[PDB]
Structures are given as structure tokens and as C-alpha cells.
């Protein structure tokens with residue numbers, strides 16, 4: 001996986 | 008596969024810098040590759056630190 005970003 | 012043995016890639020070290028590397032063995036379960044570098048050294052590099060050294 002990568003980085004979890006919020007919307 | 009997006010990654011394969013013998014593929015030329017760009018890998019990020021802990022310094023944050025990209026180095027030309029060559030993939031030697033891929034472990035898809037751990038998202039990790041063996042990558043060898045111009046000094047013949049070998050490291051295990053997380054997939055998130057690997058990008059192909061070639062545009063699609």
C-alpha cells in the first residue's frame with residue numbers, strides 16, 4: 001500500500 | 008507483472024534519494040524486492056519505494 005489521504 | 012526479475016528500476020533509499028537499481032528477486036507477499044545497485048550492493052526495498060525506470 002501507500003499513504004492514506006482524506007478527501 | 009508490474010515488477011519482474013532483471014527489471015531496471017528507480018529505488019528510494021532512507022536518505023530520500025532515488026538510485027538506479029536492478030531487481031533480482033520479487034516477494035509479492037511482502038511487497039518487497041531484492042535490488043542491486045551500481046556498487047553491487049544489495050538491499051531489500053519495499054514496493055512503495057520502487058518505480059519502473061521506464062515510462063509506460
Ligand SMILES: [Zn+2]
Nearest residue numbers: 001002038054
Ligand atoms: Zn500494498
Ligand SMILES: [Zn+2]
Nearest residue numbers: 045046047048
Ligand atoms: Zn561489480
